[PDB]
């Protein structure tokens, strides 16, 4: 399992978007190897070198942090709600790996809540990312308000314990975004949005009743959350859906889902693999943990 993950140790480089594309593989590979305990089969001496590359990616990313605590590809470009939420998502997972500045992370979380969350709980993207390949299933844009609100809310839930004391509006922001998702869940048509909003709601104990029935029923052959289209999006959605199954403590439906994800033999990679690499390894490392 670890011999195929050597290509994931990437030296981060480039502007605000490219830095997070290059940073992503190294971060989740260290996280997968710590949890699954495969550092003896990979190379024990290589862990320190990987942390320095993650610190290198973290420090280079701060060159793109705007006076508003928001992120964009370049400093003179309008900040991206998706990019800021993604930075919050990678830094939330890298707190155990490298030293993350709490003001940098909690400033971004507070900017998302104060600037980009609409009064109805919906997160708004007013300046999309140039690299559309790094957003995964969000690219279709079919149900933009529902899928982007699930994405940002997942990032806020992962940064909740770190920023609860610095961002006083975080608790209420999380429930307001979860209210919108819960109210419009049963009308979702895309299997990708069922899995990303399913997990966002599962994180706050609201994936239950008819919402839990629709979530488990959109799974084709009780193993995958497949949408007719991209095989990269299906791996990403089934990873968000596996993280919801573990959160629900439903260790009855989990075995054939993990079986399918393993049967794919997905090891990350370059072009377009940002969300599928981050999510397939976050979900497989969590399955091993639970």
């Amino acid at each position: 399992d670890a011999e195929r993950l050597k290509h994931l140790i990437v030296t981060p480089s480039g502007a605000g978007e490219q830095n997070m594309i290059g940073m992503t593989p190294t971060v989740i590979a260290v996280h997968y190897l710590d949890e699954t305990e495969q550092w003896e089969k990979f190379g024990l001496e290589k862990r320190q070198g990987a942390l320095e590359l993650i610190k290198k990616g973290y420090t280079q990313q701060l060159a793109f942090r705007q006076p508003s605590s928001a992120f964009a590809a370049f400093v003179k470009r309008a900040p991206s709600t998706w990019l800021t939420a993604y930075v919050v998502k990678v830094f939330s997972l890298a707190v155990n790996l490298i030293a993350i500045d709490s003001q940098v992370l909690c400033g971004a979380v507070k900017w998302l809540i104060l600037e980009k969350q609409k009064p109805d709980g919906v997160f708004q993207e007013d300046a999309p990312v140039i690299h559309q390949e790094m957003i995964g299933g969000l690219r279709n844009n079919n149900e933009k308000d529902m899928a982007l609100t699930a994405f940002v809310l997942i990032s806020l839930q992962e940064a909740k314990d770190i920023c609860e004391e610095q961002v006083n509006s975080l608790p209420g922001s999380i429930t307001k975004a979860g209210d919108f998702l819960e109210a419009n869940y049963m009308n979702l048509q895309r299997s990708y949005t069922v899995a990303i909003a399913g997990y966002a709601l599962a994180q706050m104990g609201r994936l239950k009743g008819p919402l839990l029935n629709k979530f488990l029923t959109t799974a084709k052959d009780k193993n995958r959350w497949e949408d007719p289209g991209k095989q990269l999006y299906n791996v990403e959605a089934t990873s968000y859906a596996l993280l919801a199954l573990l959160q629900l403590k439903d260790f009855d439906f989990v075995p054939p889902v993990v079986r399918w994800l393993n049967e794919q033999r997905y090891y990350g990679g370059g072009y377009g693999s940002t969300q599928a690499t981050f999510m397939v390894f976050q979900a497989l490392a969590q399955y091993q943990k639970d």
């Binding site: 309008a78 104060l114 600037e115 609409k118 009064p119 109805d120 708004q124 007013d126 509006s169 209420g172 429930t175 307001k176 209210d179 009743g209 008819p210």
Partner: protein, 221 residues
Amino acid sequence: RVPGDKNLTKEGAAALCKMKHLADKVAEKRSQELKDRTQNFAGYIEFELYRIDYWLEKLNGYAKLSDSDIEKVKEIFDKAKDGIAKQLPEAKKAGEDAEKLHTEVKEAAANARGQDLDDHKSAIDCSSTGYEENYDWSANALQVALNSWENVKPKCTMTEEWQTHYKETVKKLKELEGAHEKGRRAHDAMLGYANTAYAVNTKVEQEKPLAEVIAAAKEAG
């Protein structure tokens, strides 16, 4: 246990299982949901007041605005706070009522479920009521379950002291649901004003001219 005229039927045993189940879901789940959701409404209204204030601090994107232009934005911001604050005395009263009403709803349903359980006990299985879960735990669902029992109610039979607590559960759950609605109609009335103010902040940060920010404020109401 008192003597009666008719034997208990399948539709009589199922009505008893449903009334115990509805009271259990109200005492352990529904009551808390109605309280949390009613009290969150007042917190959202206050957040929009606090949030507009933070945008008002930025008039001291926003730096590109001329002296005359900032007064127009400030006026729009001050009038949105007026409309949002107008809804706060009804949403605070709803959340204060839902604090007292929750404990009366939780208590009455718990008492109605301890005597209703002893009404089954040989005891009635009640496994088909959990299968036929429709997740409707309103005072109207509790009422139609009581109405269905009242039609198949054998006058050997048992006494109905549990019914006095169940009748109180229905009455108080309607009051609790009415407090949820009183705070829902206040939250929704606050949305128009908070949307106008949100649309201005976005247009002002996108450096759109004064005519554009005013046009966007008008469309969000």
